[PDB]
From a paper:
Methionine sulfoxide reductase A (MsrA) is an important protein repair enzyme that specifically reduces methionine-S-sulfoxide to methionine. The Clostridium MsrA (CoMsrA), consisting of 209 residues, is classified into a 1-Cys type MsrA as it has a selenocysteine (Sec) residue at the catalytic site but contains no Cys residues. The CoMsrA structure folds into a common catalytic domain (residues 1–144) and a distinct helical domain (residues 145–209) which is absent from other known MsrA structures. The monomeric CoMsrA dimerizes in the presence of its substrate methionine sulfoxide via an intermolecular disulfide bond between catalytic Cys16 residues.
Dimeric CoMsrA was purified after substrate treatment to determine its crystal structure. The asymmetric unit contained one dimer and one monomer comprised of 204 residues (residues 5–208). The monomer in the asymmetric unit makes a dimer with a symmetric molecule. The area of the dimer interface was 1160 Å2 per monomer, corresponding to approximately 11% of the monomer’s surface area. The two catalytic domains from the pair of monomers face each other around the two catalytic Cys16 residues and occupy most of the dimer interface, whereas the helical domain lies distant from the interface. Interestingly, a central cavity is present in the surface model of the dimer, with a diameter of ~9 Å and a depth of ~12 Å. The two Cys16 residues constitute the base of the hole. However, although the two Cys16 residues were located close to each other in the dimeric MsrA structure within the asymmetric unit, no disulfide bond was observed. Thus, we speculate that the disulfide bond would be cleaved by intense synchrotron radiation. Interestingly, the active site pocket no longer exists in the dimeric MsrA with significant changes in the conformation of L1 and L2 loops.
Residue numbers in the entry:
A (entry chain A), B (entry chain A): 5 to 208
C-alpha cells in the first residue's frame, strides 16, 4: 500500500523500462521526461528535459543501492556528454537517496580513476511520456498486448501493473520464461485466460 | 568491394544497430540522423530529422526484402505517431528499394487491415551520429571495447568493421556466442589476441 520511488535518466527509456521492470521488487514503471523547465515535453520536444524513468519499488525487497547499481551498469556516462543537456541524471526524492547516490558515484570515480558525468539533482517534476512508449516492447507484440489490455480492462490499468513490466521485460529478452510463469500465477486469473496468455508466450 | 546500402528509421537507433549488426550479410552499420532539413543534427537537436541507421549489406547474402521484414518487426508503427515528424521512415536509394517497400507496406496494410504509418521517401542526406552512439552496447563494456579499439588501431576502424557490429550485437543479447566465435575467426588474428578477446567474452 506504501512504496518507494526512484527517478532515473539514462538515454532512451525503452531498454530501462524493460530492464528494471523485470527486476524483483519492482512494482511499477512509467517512462517520461524529467530535468527540464518547459511544461510540455514530448518525444521530439524535450526542451531541457531528459528521457527519464520512474520506478516504484519495494524497499523490503530491493534497495535504492541495488537500483543505483543497475542504473550505472545499464549505461556508460563516463564520456563527456552532457551535450547541451545531460543524458545521465539521478533524481533524488529525499536526502537518503541523494547521499547514497553522491556516495556511489564517488565510489566508481575512485575505483576507476575515471570521472562519471552523472548529475544528481532534486526531482522537480516528472512529465509522463506518450502512451506508445509505455511498455514499448509489449505494445509491439499486438496479440499478447491486446489480450492483457482486455484482462486488465483498460490501457492505464495494464501499464501500471507489475505483470506488464515483467511481460515487457520478457519480450525484450530480459526474463527467463520460468520467472514469467511465476509472476503470471501471482495474479491468480481464471485458467482459460492463463492458458491463452501462456499460449501466445510459448509460441516464440 | 561493392555493396548495397539501406537507410532506415525506427525510433532509438541503439537497438537496431545491435540487431541488424548481428544479422548475416550485414557488413557495416552507422547510426545517425536523416529525414530533416537542418544541416546540424545532434541527439537533442534533430530539427525535423529522425533517428536513423545506415546498413551496408551484401545482396548476395541478404535481400532488401529480408531487411524490410526485420525493419517492420523491430518496431510497431501501426499507431499514429507521426507526431510533428515521423519516427518510422524508409529511405530508398534507388527505385528497386522504393517499389519493394511500397509493396511490402501494402502487404501488411492488407494482411492486417491496419494502416501502417511508415514514410517512404528518397534519401536526401544521412547525418552521422555522435561517436558515443556508435556500437553503443559495445562501447559501454569498456574492457572489450578498448581491447578491440587497439586491435583495429583506431576508433573509426572498429565501428566500420563487421566484427564490432557482431560484438555489439552479442553484448545486446542478440547473438549466440557460437556465432561470435565464428565471426571472430573470420578475421584470423594472432592467437594471443584471440584468446584475450575470447577471454573477456567467456566472463559473462
Amino acid at each position: 500500500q506504501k512504496l518507494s520511488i526512484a527517478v532515473f535518466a539514462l538515454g532512451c527509456f525503452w531498454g530501462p523500462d524493460a530492464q528494471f521492470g523485470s527486476i524483483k521488487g519492482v512494482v511499477s514503471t512509467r517512462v517520461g521526461y524529467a530535468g527540464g523547465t518547459t511544461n510540455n515535453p514530448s518525444y521530439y520536444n524535450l526542451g531541457d528535459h531528459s528521457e527519464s524513468i520512474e520506478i516504484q519499488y519495494d524497499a523490503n525487497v530491493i534497495t535504492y543501492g541495488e537500483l543505483l547499481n543497475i542504473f550505472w551498469n545499464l549505461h556508460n556516462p563516463v564520456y563527456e556528454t552532457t551535450n547541451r543537456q545531460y543524458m545521465s541524471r539521478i533524481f533524488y526524492l529525499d536526502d537518503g537517496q541523494k547521499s547514497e547516490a553522491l556516495e556511489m558515484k564517488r565510489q566508481i570515480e575512485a575505483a576507476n580513476g575515471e570521472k562519471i558525468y552523472t548529475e544528481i539533482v532534486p526531482l522537480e517534476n516528472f512529465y509522463l511520456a506518450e502512451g506508445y512508449h509505455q511498455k514499448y516492447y509489449l505494445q509491439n507484440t499486438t496479440k499478447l498486448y491486446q489480450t492483457l489490455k482486455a484482462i486488465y480492462g483498460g490501457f492505464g490499468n495494464l501499464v501500471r501493473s507489475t505483470l506488464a513490466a515483467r511481460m515487457n521485460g520478457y519480450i525484450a529478452g530480459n526474463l527467463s520464461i520460468a520467472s514469467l510463469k511465476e509472476e503470471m500465477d501471482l495474479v491468480e486469473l481464471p485458467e482459460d485466460q492463463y492458458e491463452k496468455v501462456l499460449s501466445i508466450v510459448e509460441e516464440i
